[PDB]
Amino acid sequence: IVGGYTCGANTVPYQVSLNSGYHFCGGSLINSQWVVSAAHCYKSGIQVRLGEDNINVVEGNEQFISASKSIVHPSYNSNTLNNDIMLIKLKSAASLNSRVASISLPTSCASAGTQCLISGWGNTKSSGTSYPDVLKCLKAPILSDSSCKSAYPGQITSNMFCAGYLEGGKDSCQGDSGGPVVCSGKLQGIVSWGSGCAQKNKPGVYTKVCNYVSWIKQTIASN
Numbered sequence: 001i002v003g004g005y006t007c008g009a010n011t012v013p014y015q016v017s018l019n020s021g022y023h024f025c026g027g028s029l030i031n032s033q034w035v036v037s038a039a040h041c042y043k044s045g046i047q048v049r050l051g052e053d054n055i056n057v058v059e060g061n062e063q064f065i066s067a068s069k070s071i072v073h074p075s076y077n078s079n080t081l082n083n084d085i086m087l088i089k090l091k092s093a094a095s096l097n098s099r100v101a102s103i104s105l106p107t108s109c110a111s112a113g114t115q116c117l118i119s120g121w122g123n124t125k126s127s128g129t130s131y132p133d134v135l136k137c138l139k140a141p142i143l144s145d146s147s148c149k150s151a152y153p154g155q156i157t158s159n160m161f162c163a164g165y166l167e168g169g170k171d172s173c174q175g176d177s178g179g180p181v182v183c184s185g186k187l188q189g190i191v192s193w194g195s196g197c198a199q200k201n202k203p204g205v206y207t208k209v210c211n212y213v214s215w216i217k218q219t220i221a222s223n
C-alpha cells in the first residue's frame with residue numbers, strides 16, 4: 001500500500017495472507033471455511049494465515065490453515081485479468097473471534113464516491129521497493145467509470161472498478177493483490193491490477209465482487 005498508514009493489529013480481522021513459504025497475496029475470509037482472493041494469485045500449495053499483523057513474527061493471534069481446494073472463476077482471462085477472482089476452501093474451519101472475523105458479501109454494487117478501506121502487506125514505495133511486515137491500510141473512494149476508462153482505454157470491463165486518487169501518491173501495490181476493498185461493511189472489491197503504483201492518473205483496478213455473489217454463493221454451497 002503506498003501512502004497509507006499502519007492499520008493496527010487485527011483491526012482488519014477478515015484480512016488473510018496467502019503463504020507458500022512466504023507471503024505472496026492477500027485474501028478475505030467470507031465464512032469459517034472459505035476465502036476469496038484474486039485468480040492471478042492461484043498457486044498449488046497455499047497455506048492461509050489468519051489473525052496476522054506482522055507476518056514475520058508469531059504474535060500469538062494467528063491461525064495457520066492449509067487450503068484443501070482452490071476454484072478459479074470459470075471465465076478468468078489471465079491476459080485481460082477479466083473475472084479475476086478465486087475461492088479457496090480451508091482444510092479445517094477457522095475459529096472466529098474478535099481478531100479473526102468474516103466479511104459480508106454485498107447485496108448491491110457501491111456507487112462512485114463511496115469511501116472504501118483497502119489493506120495489505122504490499123510494496124510501500126512507488127519508485128522503489130520496500131516491503132512492510134505489518135498490515136497497511138488506505139481509505140480511498142470508488143472513482144467514476146469515465147475516469148477509470150479514460151485512464152485505461154479499451155481495458156476496463158464491467159467486472160472492474162477503479163478506486164484511489166488521480167493525482168497519485170496513494171494506491172494498492174504488488175503484494176496487495178487478492179486483498180479486500182471494503183465499503184460500508186461489505187466486501188466490494190479485490191486488489192487486481194494497475195499501472196505501477198500510486199502514479200498520477202493511474203488508479204488501482206479492482207474486481208467488482210457485487211457481479212459474482214451468485215457464483216460465490218452457489219460454488220461454496222456445492223463444495
Ligand SMILES: N=C(N)c1ccc2nc(C(=O)c3nc4ccc(C(=N)N)cc4[nH]3)[nH]c2c1
Nearest residue numbers: 172173174177192193194195196197204205
Ligand atoms: N507471481 C505471482 N503469482 C504474482 C502474484 C500477484 C501479482 N500481482 C502482480 C502485479 O503485477 C501487480 N499487482 C498489483 C496490484 C495493484 C497494483 C496497483 N497499482 N493498484 C499494481 C499491481 N501490479 N504480479 C503478480 C504476480
Ligand SMILES: [Ca+2]
Nearest residue numbers: 054057058059
Ligand atoms: Ca504474525
